[PDB]
């Protein structure tokens, strides 16, 4: 029971390492074409500045 839950937490960290790799992988793939549009998603959000404002 200690072991049963500790088991799950282990799985939880396991889960996040998998997700991490995927994320680093997907960044890489999107890197093939400039993530610049990410730099547009950013400014535009900062542009969302005035919006809110």
């Amino acid at each position: 029971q200690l072991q049963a839950a500790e088991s799950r937490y282990e799985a939880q960290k396991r889960i996040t390492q998998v997700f991490e790799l995927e994320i680093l992988d997907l960044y890489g793939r999107l890197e093939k074409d400039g993530l610049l549009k990410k730099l547009e998603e950013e400014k535009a959000e900062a542009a969302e500045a005035a919006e809110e404002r």
Binding site: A4, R8, I15, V18, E22
Partner: protein
């Protein structure tokens, strides 16, 4: 077997379950259908012996199963197109570090063993979570508890085939079929994909409760049962093909005979 059943019920009623008593009962007689998954779970330590803790622990296991399932889906590793056994394979691989670069990367020889056992478990155990858990534990036992014994079993097979029918062993040797026998099917997959699960489960009753020698006696027994048809086969080629693909309808008998053989050669203890 009613009274096999009543005798089991009397053990299951203990507030703390006797693991050792549940083991020897399984070694001695077959488990009744309605209590098989429960006993296997207790024996593979998926439910603690302490009867009260069952629901508390089953929760953790269900929640972990769901979390892991979801994560596999979030990444592309499983979908609803995915068959249950591949789902358990990836869950195991995830929870153990060993998850491939992608779901397409080809299946390493040990993965195919997992798949084989998992497909068999599916027919023995209805609940999807119990099933995962038992497959995970069952396979883990082959890799740990039996890690050293499993490579010794091909020798045992020759030792015991010989005492039971020398001539057949000779015939196997003469065809130089002895090194081409499907050992992984017998002692890696423990007969998964070879015996119909309705009978295979009575073999696994024994494997689960601590004996892997029983596997040798199923092999010896498969050979005795098809003595006549095998002695007729000349190529080693023909022999291996046949042992890979054996007629199904004798299996009920093969397994019972096998169990007898194993008792004869090895024995086992008494039970109320």
């Amino acid at each position: 077997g009613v009274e096999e059943k009543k005798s089991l019920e009397i053990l299951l009623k203990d507030d703390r379950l006797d693991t050792e008593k549940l083991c020897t009962f399984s070694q001695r007689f077959p488990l009744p259908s309605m209590y098989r998954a429960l006993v296997w779970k207790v024996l593979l330590g998926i439910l603690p012996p302490h009867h009260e803790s069952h629901a508390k622990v089953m929760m953790y296991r269900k929640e972990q199963y769901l979390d892991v399932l979801h994560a596999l889906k979030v990444v592309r590793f499983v979908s609803d197109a995915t068959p249950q056994a591949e789902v358990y394979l990836r869950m195991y691989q995830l929870e153990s570090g060993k998850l491939p670069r992608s779901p397409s990367f080809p299946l390493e020889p040990d993965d195919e063993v997992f798949l084989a056992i998992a497909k068999a478990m599916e027919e023995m155990v209805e609940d999807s979570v119990d099933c995962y858990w038992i497959t995970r534990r069952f396979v883990n036992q082959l890799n740990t508890k039996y890690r050293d014994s499993l490579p010794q079993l091909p020798k045992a097979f020759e030792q015991y085939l010989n005492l039971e029918d020398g001539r057949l062993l000779t015939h196997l040797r003469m065809c130089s079929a002895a090194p081409k026998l499907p050992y992984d099917l017998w002692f890696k997959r423990c007969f998964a994909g070879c015996l119909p699960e309705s009978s295979l489960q009575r073999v696994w009753d024994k494997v689960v409760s601590g004996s892997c020698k029983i596997l040798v006696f199923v092999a010896v027994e498969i050979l005795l049962t098809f003595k006549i048809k095998v002695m007729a086969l000349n190529s080693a080629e023909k022999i291996t093909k046949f042992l890979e693909n054996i007629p199904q309808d004798s299996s009920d008998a093969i397994v019972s005979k096998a169990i007898d053989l194993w008792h004869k050669h090895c024995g086992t203890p008494v039970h109320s």
